[PDB]
């Protein structure tokens, strides 16, 4: 409701033109980091869900992703197509 003057000096102490950073700077860390979810918090999943729980984030975001085998007509998940035989 009143007028702001600055940012507390202790916050700057330990927190803080065109940027020079690169989004690709994240690859190194990303290679070593387990799968993350946007809105399923990792620590809460450890506490409240089983360690072997299957998890699909936003399972109804889009329709089921699949293709159909030309030979046998089976619906195949995209990760199952290469290995699929008759």
């Amino acid at each position: 409701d009143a007028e702001i003057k600055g940012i507390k000096p202790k916050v700057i102490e330990e927190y803080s033109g065109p940027s020079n950073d690169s989004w690709k700077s994240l690859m190194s860390s990303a290679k070593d980091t387990p799968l993350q979810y946007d809105h399923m918090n990792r620590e809460s999943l450890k506490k409240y869900f089983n360690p072997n729980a299957q998890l699909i984030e936003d399972p109804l975001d889009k329709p089921i992703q699949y293709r159909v085998c030309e030979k046998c007509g089976k619906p195949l998940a995209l990760t199952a197509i290469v290995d699929h035989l008759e």
């Binding site: 007028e3 702001i4 918090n41």
Partner: protein, 91 residues
């Protein structure tokens, strides 16, 4: 200067509080049905305008979606942001 906004946001992220705000906002909007209303609004605008062009569809959806935010969610989330802001700015 307008470096202030970016400064404040960086602090909110480093402190963990940006996540708390972002996550609580998302949860509120989801539970009150706003997320799905905005999806329905978007499908409707695509049908009315016979277009899937993101820029033109957004121009009609966004203003309306912002108006659709419940007063309850707006004031609860603002209250929370202001508490985290009153932590680290002098006024």
């Amino acid at each position: 200067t307008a470096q202030l906004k970016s400064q404040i946001q960086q602090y909110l992220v480093e402190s963990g509080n940006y996540e708390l705000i972002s996550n609580e906002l998302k949860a509120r909007l989801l539970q009150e049905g706003w997320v799905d209303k905005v999806k329905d609004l978007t499908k409707s605008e695509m049908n009315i305008n016979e277009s899937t062009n993101f820029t033109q569809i957004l121009s009609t959806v966004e203003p309306k979606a912002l108006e659709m935010v419940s007063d309850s969610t707006r004031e609860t989330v603002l209250k929370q942001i202001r508490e985290f802001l009153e932590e680290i700015v002098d006024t």
